[PDB]
Swiss-Prot record, chain A:
The lineage of its organism: Viruses, Duplodnaviria, Heunggongvirae, Uroviricota, Caudoviricetes. The gene is E. The chain holds residues 294 to 341 of 341 of the full protein. This is Major capsid protein. Signal peptide: none annotated. It is found in: Virion; Host cytoplasm. Homomultimer. Interacts with FI protein.
Curated annotation (Swiss-Prot), chain C:
The chain holds residues 215 to 267 of 533 of the full protein. It is found in: Virion. Belongs to the siphoviridae portal protein family. Forms the portal vertex of the capsid. This portal plays critical roles in head assembly, genome packaging, neck/tail attachment, and genome ejection. The portal protein multimerizes as a single ring-shaped homododecamer arranged around a central channel. Binds to the terminase subunits to form the packaging machine. Proteolytically cleaved by the viral protease during capsid maturation. The gene is B. Homododecamer. Interacts with the terminase complex composed of two small and one large terminase subunits. This is Portal protein B. It comes from Escherichia phage lambda.
Length: 48, 47, 53
């Protein structure tokens, strides 16, 4: 929200925690909802 | 009320349909003014 | 035998007039010209019948 990148595909993020332990992280967030317009266009068959 | 939904594309589901007959066997189209139509077949077997 | 239609543009993409149409419209929106004989069709037909009888 600070950087105004509310809409995206990937979001890198790194930060370091305070206190005695010099602890820092790496982080990527995403919300993928990969979909298809026609559910019936594809015909899937389990062979035997 | 506050859901602010967004609409994506909608599937169409087109029906399966193709004459193969009117475009192939029925080229001529005739409308009627009368109430009936006759058809004539001429049997030709010349001896 | 079947009567088959064909669609023809009035002008070519290059501007050559493919299909010349000439007539005299009488009011806005008219698409087809009308022969002048419309107002006298019945008079002509009935006078022909008159001379015959």
């Amino acid at each position: 929200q600070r950087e105004g990148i509310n809409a995206s595909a990937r979001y890198p993020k790194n930060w370091v925690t305070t206190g005695d332990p010099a602890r820092e992280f790496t982080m990527i967030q995403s919300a993928p909802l990969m979909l298809l317009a026609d559910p019936d266009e594809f015909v899937s068959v389990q062979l035997a | 009320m506050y859901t602010t939904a967004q609409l994506l594309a909608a599937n169409e589901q087109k029906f399966k349909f193709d004459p193969l007959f009117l475009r192939l066997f029925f080229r001529e189209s005739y409308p009627f003014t009368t109430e009936k139509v006759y058809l004539s077949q001429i049997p030709g077997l010349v001896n | 035998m079947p009567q088959k239609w064909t669609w023809i543009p009035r002008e070519l993409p290059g501007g050559r007039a493919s299909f010349i149409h000439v007539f005299e419209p009488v009011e806005d929106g008219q698409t087809r010209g009308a022969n002048v004989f419309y107002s006298v069709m019945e008079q002509m037909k009935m006078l022909d019948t008159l001379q015959n009888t």
